[PDB]
Amino acid sequence: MYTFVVRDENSSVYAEVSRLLLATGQWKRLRKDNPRFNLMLGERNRLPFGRLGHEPGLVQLVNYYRGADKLCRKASLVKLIKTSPELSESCTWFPESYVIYPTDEREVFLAAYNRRREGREGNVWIAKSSILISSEASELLDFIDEVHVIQKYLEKPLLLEPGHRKFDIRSWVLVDHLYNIYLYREGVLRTSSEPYNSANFQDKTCHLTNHCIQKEYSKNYGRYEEGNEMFFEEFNQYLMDALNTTLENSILLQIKHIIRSCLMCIEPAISTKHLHYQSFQLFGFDFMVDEELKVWLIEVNGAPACAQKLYAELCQGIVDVAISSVFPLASIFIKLHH
């Protein structure tokens, strides 16, 4: 009879993870401040990592990797890519990014921006907090003074037909206590139900593919799919019939290279191998695919949520390979080798 504690009530993913654990009749949920637990399903910000692994007779495991915020915080991710020789500034799969404070990267940003204007190259950028899409240095820098990251906007993206619509691929990755990187076979395409405007960047409906902005600012929401959710089997069919190739060959291969290269990079800083406590974590990798079928990384989410139809399969995979591996009772993933 193993014990757990729930310290993040808002997590839909670990709410289902809790539900499945009790349902086995080998797990008991303790009070959120009872220290005599095996598993902590901890709070998003300020998790007491320093307190875990100090209870004798108990093998303790947490649903977070201490320091995985270097990869998940927007300004930190840029910094990690730029400083770490494992990724470096010689990195092909991540858009040109600069950290701007309202230490700084203001000097080097203008330097690369002005080389593009005179170089007769597209100067469309994006701004986000750790939301603005503009071509002028004024509108970008002036907005931050109302901490952000100025990233190269994907001017030539790939568009699904019918619809001439933008999208983004969300992949779920589980890194267990042994640092085995597992990619869930199912992913989702956060599509933009409105057609892409090549010249207009004022309307933030056809540019932001988020499920929240489509259920709020999009008129033709839920037209092509439900709601703006295209799954892999369906997307693969579009790639074969409309582009000849497969999802595995044109996209999945690059995604896997990105996941691996990212998580291997921070393995020496977050690995809980010779530690008093063990960690595991579910991540949400966000990708953009250009028209040349080249995969780009947008953001890493430390606390992702799932697509309602996949919760069942993903949350069972979490308890199967990340929990019951450590706490044995009485594949739906792709193991990314390293």
Partner: peptide, 21 residues
């Protein structure tokens, strides 16, 4: 002795006030 004493505390932790560690 230590194993069984810790087992008793860890198996029935609700019967021991949390505010007296």
């Amino acid at each position: 002795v230590d194993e069984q004493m810790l087992n008793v505390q860890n198996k029935n932790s609700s019967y021991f006030v949390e505010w007296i560690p």
